[PDB]
Amino acid sequence: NYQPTPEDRFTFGLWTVGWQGRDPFGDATRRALDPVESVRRLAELGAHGVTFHDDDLIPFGSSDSEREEHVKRFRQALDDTGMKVPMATTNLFTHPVFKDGGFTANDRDVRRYALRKTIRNIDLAVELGAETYVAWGGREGAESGGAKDVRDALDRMKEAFDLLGEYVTSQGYDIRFAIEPKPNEPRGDILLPTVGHALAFIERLERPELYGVNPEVGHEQMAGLNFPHGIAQALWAGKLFHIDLNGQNGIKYDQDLRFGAGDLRAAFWLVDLLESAGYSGPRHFDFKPPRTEDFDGVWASAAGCMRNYLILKERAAAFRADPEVQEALRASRLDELARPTAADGLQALLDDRSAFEEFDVDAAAARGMAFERLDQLAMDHLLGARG
Amino acid sequence: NYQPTPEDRFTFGLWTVGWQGRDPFGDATRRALDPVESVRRLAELGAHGVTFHDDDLIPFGSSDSEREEHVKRFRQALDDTGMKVPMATTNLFTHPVFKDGGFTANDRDVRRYALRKTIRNIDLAVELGAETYVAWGGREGAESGGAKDVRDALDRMKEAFDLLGEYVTSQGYDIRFAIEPKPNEPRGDILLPTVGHALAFIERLERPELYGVNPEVGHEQMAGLNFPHGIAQALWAGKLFHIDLNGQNGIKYDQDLRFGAGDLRAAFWLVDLLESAGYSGPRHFDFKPPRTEDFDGVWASAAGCMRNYLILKERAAAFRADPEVQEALRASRLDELARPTAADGLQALLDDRSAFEEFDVDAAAARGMAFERLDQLAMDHLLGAR
Amino acid sequence: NYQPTPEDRFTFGLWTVGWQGRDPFGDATRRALDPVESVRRLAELGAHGVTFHDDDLIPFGSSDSEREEHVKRFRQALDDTGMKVPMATTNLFTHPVFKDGGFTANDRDVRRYALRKTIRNIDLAVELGAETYVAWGGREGAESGGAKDVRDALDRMKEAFDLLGEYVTSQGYDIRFAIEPKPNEPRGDILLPTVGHALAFIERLERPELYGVNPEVGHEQMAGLNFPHGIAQALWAGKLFHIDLNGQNGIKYDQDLRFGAGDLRAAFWLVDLLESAGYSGPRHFDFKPPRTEDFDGVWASAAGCMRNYLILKERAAAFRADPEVQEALRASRLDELARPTAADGLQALLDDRSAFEEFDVDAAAARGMAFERLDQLAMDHLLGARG
Amino acid sequence: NYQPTPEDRFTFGLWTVGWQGRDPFGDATRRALDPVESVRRLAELGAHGVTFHDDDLIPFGSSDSEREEHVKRFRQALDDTGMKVPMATTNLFTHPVFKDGGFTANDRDVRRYALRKTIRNIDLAVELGAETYVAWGGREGAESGGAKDVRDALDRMKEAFDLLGEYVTSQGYDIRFAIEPKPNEPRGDILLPTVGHALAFIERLERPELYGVNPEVGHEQMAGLNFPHGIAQALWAGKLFHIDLNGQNGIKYDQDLRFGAGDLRAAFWLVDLLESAGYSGPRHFDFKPPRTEDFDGVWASAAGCMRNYLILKERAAAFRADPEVQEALRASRLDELARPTAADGLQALLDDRSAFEEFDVDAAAARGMAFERLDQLAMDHLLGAR
Ligand SMILES: [Ca+2]
Ligand SMILES: [Ca+2]
Ligand SMILES: [Ca+2]
Ligand SMILES: [Ca+2]
Ligand SMILES: [Mg+2]
Ligand SMILES: [Mg+2]
Ligand SMILES: [Mg+2]
Ligand SMILES: [Mg+2]
Ligand SMILES: [Mg+2]
Ligand SMILES: [Mg+2]
Ligand code: NA
Ligand code: NA
Ligand code: NA
Ligand code: NA
């Protein structure tokens, strides 16, 4: 019955199940969770591991002895359960000091602090076994046009990520970075607002091989973009280092619904792509159990994340295995799309009368794509309504 | 005043003033314009030049003789007026053959044809003096998830742009390519949907230096993005080869309103950035006079594009030249943003207790950014209410 | 296997399957369909009936003898098949004369023409058995702020709909009107942009009982609204006279995908609501087979509209019948929502200490809503992944 | 100039200037403001009055004695300055008890409490002189489809508003209610999501004359709607009891920027309409100074709200007073829109061959609307570029 097990690689942030329910218009509806409790409960649900922001695990402003106690307890829970920590990240957004950014704050002293805060937590992430270190620059941006010279901000952004790369290289760490885009919220506009912008920026870093993306379902959907398509571009670039899975209903505030909620067909096509491409990284959920829920509802929502992935995995696999689908894909020329356009080379293409003077454009135009029949097979598979 | 002159480098597509007004739900409201009349009237309005899709200038399916006559007439009008042709592009979207794409059509024979159609028009563009060749892949994408394997499509897209680069290199042409993003419409989702996606894709081409972006105001706004921010990233990357200027009211179909319409404050900040950065390319308008209008309204709308650029240019310049604004920029630490974060280097940063152990976070957090005063000065300048 | 039959009340516009594929950036990809052919093909698919704009059935500008031939042929096909015509409408958007509107064109002569064109087709609709006459004011609106005084436009809009009501009353017709909202496209902003605006406007008409709404899935979704919620408000007002079913992916141009495409979960909740509320009107599809398709794909797409409704109907019925769901609904207090708040009356409420000084707000706040468990039962039912 | 004076009727919520800056992802950046300080500072800035939620003025859970002292201090500051309180409202959204709603909570005991909390504050509002009592049902709605039966919720909503109407009638109060729509946030979808939905709902209440709308600029824009159009429909219905003025950049979270920010041209057309229609209610700002700002930036941002209204008022008045604009309005047949379509009556229309049989559709279609010239005059006026 779609029961997750550790090899399914499902992970959760401490801040997900641990979200107390404060929003822009409301106070907390749930008590804080002890990270130890979350590790044990997630393990019992069949999770593979957890992730954290520095300040989720160690309260901001902790002394070194307080810090070591929080880390010791957490490590004992990880030890006891075999839960992994594949990813961690820095909170560069909550504290008021980051109101204008971390790495791109106009105040230089804040930018330096942001880097030091990040470096401290890289060391901890590495100790705990993380392979990826995520950066969500939620405060990088502006509400007004004069407040932020974006070229200079990108210079600062590059400087910061280059220093982090120099740091991990100097320590011999194999951890890689994953930049997480978001278009807006909490800033009016956030820098590097989409997968594409982040991918482009990475190509201007000194050591681009150390950086990839951590796309989040809902974030690309906040710009009305097709999440599967963006994932395909990330995979095509070799840069899908990690992913955040959740749900979102279109263009509005960041909802962080459980995975499978929001745009269900997009979730189907995402799972189909990840499985077809052989994505091997964590299936990480960055979600918030709605503040209507009590803790039983927290754990139900978490369990639903994993369940929906597994159901969708089964349906996508059935779709791709169905001989009727395989024939529909041929009818729609998906196989021709995989063939090089002109492996014969430029001069042969220029000399090919079949490609121009003798190309019967009308006959080609008349050939239907058969995409609706293919899509209704896909629908039937998703809904368990075959044959 | 605000009267354009050719040195302002304002350009217009033939398809802009020449839009006959057919929409999803409506027939044409205006007759077709002869390209020669558009060249002459835009010259009279103070334009610098014009641009075209192949099929705007030479009707699809024209014989060689027909083609020659269309081109000859056009060149006579250009030569008579001194109008330039800084950019051209291919129509890979109107003909039914392109219903699933040009470069990324599932049908391989269509992909080959798309390349041949493009190459024919690159040759013409070069003869006319174009510096940039635009590509808007408006039919590249899908309405359904199974229809288009996006990784394979990106392989096909790369192969196409690489062949075009090979072609121009083989002919010794100086022309460069500019990819124009759009997120959707006419496809349910279009590949390379934003400036970012196009910039990223370019870095995987074999000769990336030959390709840049042609961002369009309204297209980025159809994804709710900040167009000035995206232009800043394109400038930062050295890839703002060309631009399309127009207006758009948020997230909906592509409106192509005259420049200045739609998001007026975004237009202000865009002009401020282009002028500040020294963008030297064409100020090209890709707009549609609304189908409500007759030809007099066509030419009014075109004149409005240029007028609005010029008004905004004045206001942005006055903003930047105002000592009170310069004071406010300092108060908001725009100057500190330009200083390197850690020119002292990594080790020095690590050893700096003022950056962590002894950093007074509370004192830093208490410092207001003064962004609202700065923005109200910007508003006052925009509105001529100083 | 989810095969539609006439009592399922599925209807289609002539302009749906007959869409030739012209868009803003492209020429037609399919030949025109003879209305006779469409009637016969839709009948063979299990449709209940068809609908039309005047100009779909009789080419604009037809002489009276040409008109009668087109109508005669159509009537013979309806006769032969038993297909019904439950609804018709006017094309007040295609011809250039309507570039600034029909009923709210600034030019008075155009407004009068629009009314005459509409009245002529009301008579035909009535003859053919229509119960509803739809009005989509696609050209009513503006691209710029000075072009349209909206108060005066609403005066004109009211005048027009009042005249139509006076007309149908004068002829003793039992046909009712259904206003179809859309927020934008082809105008920059369209008047009466949502279900709510249309419902409100109707209350200012002289004979409000003669008018309701014809909401379309995709149109409310073009404003990012929840279509099921808007339908619930229409039903609550007694004004769901007709509906247009299709699919849409969020905030963008009007896609008119086949029903079930676009927002699949919204389609589920819509069907659940229509069936639970006992909506008895036509299940009408206003969709466009994508221009990628040939005619085989046209008919496949049409068939998919009906199939998806039927699958969703089955899943919603299973959801509501499941005792586990019935208990989850009780756990979430859906039953309490159905109870009057204060049937004891205002004074009793004011005197009830349990409602204020003695109300334990903390204990109430602590009670989780259990909405995630309920929603995951709903997901499991939609996907055929129970128990 | 553009200096506000009390006669301009500018008002502000205590929660606006008093917003401490907590957002989804961030802690407060400013200390709490004492309501008395806000009254005095807004008076000094030229405001007419202030508004409040119950819990802005009297901390939730305050004892009777505490409550009396908070109210006494506030009234002394009002009386000292002559500031008015034209509107008040209830906080039915912050406390966890309201997590599924107030009036439409699934839990009946919560619904009853919500009503009692509202009624207590209506009494206070009346004592302070409020003419309008706002209701923003920000927690009424759902994140999932099964959670909320919307027809039953609308029954509960109607029952609540009817009880409130019964209450005010029973006490002989003159106060009227204004429902404030919002489409989403904090709920995934909020009930009564737009002006239209609220206007429709009001017509099903037992005493519809007692209820109107309190539209907010940014809320309608979160659905991509045209705010001036929605205000025109509210005015047409006789239901614009109050308004919330602010700025928003399109479809995203509720920004609550200062008025004039966001969609500047929409702000222009809004002011033009309010002034033209003779709206006589408060010009109320529901805005948040960005959390980047310190208190000096709070007061700058508040001053900016009023300044921008005044600049736009000037420019809209100059537009309407310009004989060239009046000419253009005639050219675009705005005057013909005001004439009845068929005052001759139905039969005359039916018998009029000039309306159908002999109507020259082509000649009519050829007549340009001249809307672009009109809009460029409007742009020129807005920008002070005539
Ligand atoms: Ca998120
Ligand atoms: Ca465009
Ligand atoms: Ca539609
Ligand atoms: Ca707001
Ligand atoms: Mg995330
Ligand atoms: Mg493959
Ligand atoms: Mg363009
Ligand atoms: Mg429709
Ligand atoms: Mg019921
Ligand atoms: Mg408000
Ligand atoms: Na939420
Ligand atoms: Na051609
Ligand atoms: Na489409
Ligand atoms: Na209180």
PDB file of C-alpha atoms in Angstrom, chain A residues 1-2 29 224-225 249 251-252 258-265 287-290 292-294 297 300-301 304-305 307-308 311-312 315 365-373 375-377 379-387, chain C residues 1-2 29 224-225 249 251-252 258-265 287-290 292-294 297 300-301 304-305 307-308 311-312 315 365-373 375-377 379-387:
ATOM      1  CA  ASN A   1       0.000   0.000   0.000  1.00  0.00           C
ATOM      2  CA  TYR A   2       2.544   2.629  -1.141  1.00  0.00           C
ATOM      3  CA  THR A  29      -0.997  27.148  16.130  1.00  0.00           C
ATOM      4  CA  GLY A 224       3.555  30.401 -13.673  1.00  0.00           C
ATOM      5  CA  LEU A 225       6.326  28.253 -15.123  1.00  0.00           C
ATOM      6  CA  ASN A 249      -1.888  26.416  -6.612  1.00  0.00           C
ATOM      7  CA  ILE A 251       0.481  32.337  -8.839  1.00  0.00           C
ATOM      8  CA  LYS A 252       0.157  33.473  -5.261  1.00  0.00           C
ATOM      9  CA  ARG A 258       2.277  18.577   0.707  1.00  0.00           C
ATOM     10  CA  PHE A 259       3.657  16.996  -2.445  1.00  0.00           C
ATOM     11  CA  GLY A 260       0.902  15.841  -4.797  1.00  0.00           C
ATOM     12  CA  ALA A 261      -1.359  18.712  -3.712  1.00  0.00           C
ATOM     13  CA  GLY A 262      -1.507  21.756  -5.942  1.00  0.00           C
ATOM     14  CA  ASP A 263      -0.914  20.898  -9.562  1.00  0.00           C
ATOM     15  CA  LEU A 264      -1.390  17.125  -9.592  1.00  0.00           C
ATOM     16  CA  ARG A 265      -0.659  16.576 -13.278  1.00  0.00           C
ATOM     17  CA  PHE A 287       6.424  21.683   2.802  1.00  0.00           C
ATOM     18  CA  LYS A 288       4.313  23.071   5.641  1.00  0.00           C
ATOM     19  CA  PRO A 289       1.497  21.094   7.221  1.00  0.00           C
ATOM     20  CA  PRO A 290      -1.294  23.696   7.135  1.00  0.00           C
ATOM     21  CA  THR A 292      -5.244  24.184  10.691  1.00  0.00           C
ATOM     22  CA  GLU A 293      -3.608  20.893  11.707  1.00  0.00           C
ATOM     23  CA  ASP A 294      -2.564  19.473  15.057  1.00  0.00           C
ATOM     24  CA  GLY A 297      -2.159  16.128  11.043  1.00  0.00           C
ATOM     25  CA  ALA A 300      -0.403  12.603   8.215  1.00  0.00           C
ATOM     26  CA  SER A 301       0.656  15.410   5.842  1.00  0.00           C
ATOM     27  CA  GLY A 304       1.078  11.967   2.310  1.00  0.00           C
ATOM     28  CA  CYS A 305       4.086  13.566   0.674  1.00  0.00           C
ATOM     29  CA  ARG A 307       2.587   8.291  -0.499  1.00  0.00           C
ATOM     30  CA  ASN A 308       1.793  10.623  -3.392  1.00  0.00           C
ATOM     31  CA  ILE A 311       1.536   6.444  -6.279  1.00  0.00           C
ATOM     32  CA  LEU A 312       2.734   8.759  -9.048  1.00  0.00           C
ATOM     33  CA  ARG A 315       1.416   5.321 -12.515  1.00  0.00           C
ATOM     34  CA  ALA A 365       1.465  20.399 -42.018  1.00  0.00           C
ATOM     35  CA  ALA A 366      -1.425  17.996 -42.614  1.00  0.00           C
ATOM     36  CA  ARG A 367       0.165  15.319 -40.398  1.00  0.00           C
ATOM     37  CA  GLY A 368      -1.586  15.468 -37.026  1.00  0.00           C
ATOM     38  CA  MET A 369       0.605  15.154 -33.965  1.00  0.00           C
ATOM     39  CA  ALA A 370      -1.762  12.771 -32.159  1.00  0.00           C
ATOM     40  CA  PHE A 371      -0.933  14.507 -28.865  1.00  0.00           C
ATOM     41  CA  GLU A 372      -4.502  14.368 -27.463  1.00  0.00           C
ATOM     42  CA  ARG A 373      -4.734  10.579 -27.722  1.00  0.00           C
ATOM     43  CA  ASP A 375      -2.364  12.717 -23.268  1.00  0.00           C
ATOM     44  CA  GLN A 376      -5.612  10.866 -22.628  1.00  0.00           C
ATOM     45  CA  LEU A 377      -3.635   7.626 -22.217  1.00  0.00           C
ATOM     46  CA  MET A 379      -4.686  10.762 -17.918  1.00  0.00           C
ATOM     47  CA  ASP A 380      -6.172   7.264 -17.879  1.00  0.00           C
ATOM     48  CA  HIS A 381      -2.941   5.912 -16.344  1.00  0.00           C
ATOM     49  CA  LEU A 382      -2.756   8.649 -13.682  1.00  0.00           C
ATOM     50  CA  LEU A 383      -6.372   8.027 -12.662  1.00  0.00           C
ATOM     51  CA  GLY A 384      -6.112   4.195 -12.753  1.00  0.00           C
ATOM     52  CA  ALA A 385      -8.817   4.192 -15.496  1.00  0.00           C
ATOM     53  CA  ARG A 386      -7.214   1.862 -18.130  1.00  0.00           C
ATOM     54  CA  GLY A 387      -7.741   0.277 -20.600  1.00  0.00           C
TER      55      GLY A 387
ATOM     56  CA  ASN C   1     -15.388   1.755 -19.726  1.00  0.00           C
ATOM     57  CA  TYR C   2     -16.670   5.297 -19.019  1.00  0.00           C
ATOM     58  CA  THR C  29      -4.311  23.915 -39.332  1.00  0.00           C
ATOM     59  CA  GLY C 224      -6.408  32.670 -10.377  1.00  0.00           C
ATOM     60  CA  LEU C 225      -9.757  31.992  -8.727  1.00  0.00           C
ATOM     61  CA  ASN C 249      -3.150  25.964 -16.684  1.00  0.00           C
ATOM     62  CA  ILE C 251      -2.956  32.581 -15.341  1.00  0.00           C
ATOM     63  CA  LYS C 252      -2.312  33.007 -19.029  1.00  0.00           C
ATOM     64  CA  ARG C 258     -10.246  19.466 -22.992  1.00  0.00           C
ATOM     65  CA  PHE C 259     -12.047  18.990 -19.695  1.00  0.00           C
ATOM     66  CA  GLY C 260      -9.898  17.179 -17.133  1.00  0.00           C
ATOM     67  CA  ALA C 261      -6.726  18.765 -18.532  1.00  0.00           C
ATOM     68  CA  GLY C 262      -5.340  21.779 -16.730  1.00  0.00           C
ATOM     69  CA  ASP C 263      -6.120  21.716 -13.045  1.00  0.00           C
ATOM     70  CA  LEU C 264      -7.155  18.100 -12.493  1.00  0.00           C
ATOM     71  CA  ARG C 265      -7.941  18.381  -8.789  1.00  0.00           C
ATOM     72  CA  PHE C 287     -12.907  23.632 -25.599  1.00  0.00           C
ATOM     73  CA  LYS C 288     -10.500  23.689 -28.540  1.00  0.00           C
ATOM     74  CA  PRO C 289      -8.725  20.576 -29.761  1.00  0.00           C
ATOM     75  CA  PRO C 290      -5.138  21.866 -29.950  1.00  0.00           C
ATOM     76  CA  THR C 292      -1.411  20.289 -33.429  1.00  0.00           C
ATOM     77  CA  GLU C 293      -4.229  17.794 -34.037  1.00  0.00           C
ATOM     78  CA  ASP C 294      -5.837  16.458 -37.193  1.00  0.00           C
ATOM     79  CA  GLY C 297      -7.406  14.110 -32.777  1.00  0.00           C
ATOM     80  CA  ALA C 300     -10.320  11.968 -29.549  1.00  0.00           C
ATOM     81  CA  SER C 301     -10.134  15.257 -27.607  1.00  0.00           C
ATOM     82  CA  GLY C 304     -11.769  12.762 -23.656  1.00  0.00           C
ATOM     83  CA  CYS C 305     -13.867  15.613 -22.334  1.00  0.00           C
ATOM     84  CA  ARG C 307     -14.516  10.383 -20.419  1.00  0.00           C
ATOM     85  CA  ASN C 308     -12.795  12.586 -17.846  1.00  0.00           C
ATOM     86  CA  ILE C 311     -14.111   9.069 -14.417  1.00  0.00           C
ATOM     87  CA  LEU C 312     -14.233  12.018 -12.019  1.00  0.00           C
ATOM     88  CA  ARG C 315     -14.268   8.839  -8.085  1.00  0.00           C
ATOM     89  CA  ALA C 365      -7.610  26.565  19.104  1.00  0.00           C
ATOM     90  CA  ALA C 366      -5.873  23.328  20.098  1.00  0.00           C
ATOM     91  CA  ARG C 367      -8.444  21.212  18.220  1.00  0.00           C
ATOM     92  CA  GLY C 368      -6.867  20.210  14.908  1.00  0.00           C
ATOM     93  CA  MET C 369      -9.089  20.368  11.858  1.00  0.00           C
ATOM     94  CA  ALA C 370      -7.892  17.029  10.456  1.00  0.00           C
ATOM     95  CA  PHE C 371      -8.068  18.490   6.936  1.00  0.00           C
ATOM     96  CA  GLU C 372      -4.876  16.781   5.664  1.00  0.00           C
ATOM     97  CA  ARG C 373      -6.136  13.275   6.438  1.00  0.00           C
ATOM     98  CA  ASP C 375      -7.604  15.547   1.673  1.00  0.00           C
ATOM     99  CA  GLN C 376      -5.356  12.507   1.378  1.00  0.00           C
ATOM    100  CA  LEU C 377      -8.452  10.273   1.353  1.00  0.00           C
ATOM    101  CA  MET C 379      -6.378  12.139  -3.298  1.00  0.00           C
ATOM    102  CA  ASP C 380      -6.379   8.368  -2.825  1.00  0.00           C
ATOM    103  CA  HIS C 381      -9.922   8.191  -4.253  1.00  0.00           C
ATOM    104  CA  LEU C 382      -9.096  10.398  -7.263  1.00  0.00           C
ATOM    105  CA  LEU C 383      -6.040   8.281  -8.090  1.00  0.00           C
ATOM    106  CA  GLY C 384      -7.774   4.906  -7.490  1.00  0.00           C
ATOM    107  CA  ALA C 385      -5.210   4.216  -4.699  1.00  0.00           C
ATOM    108  CA  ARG C 386      -7.523   3.075  -1.820  1.00  0.00           C
ATOM    109  CA  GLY C 387      -7.589   1.759   0.855  1.00  0.00           C
TER     110      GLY C 387
END
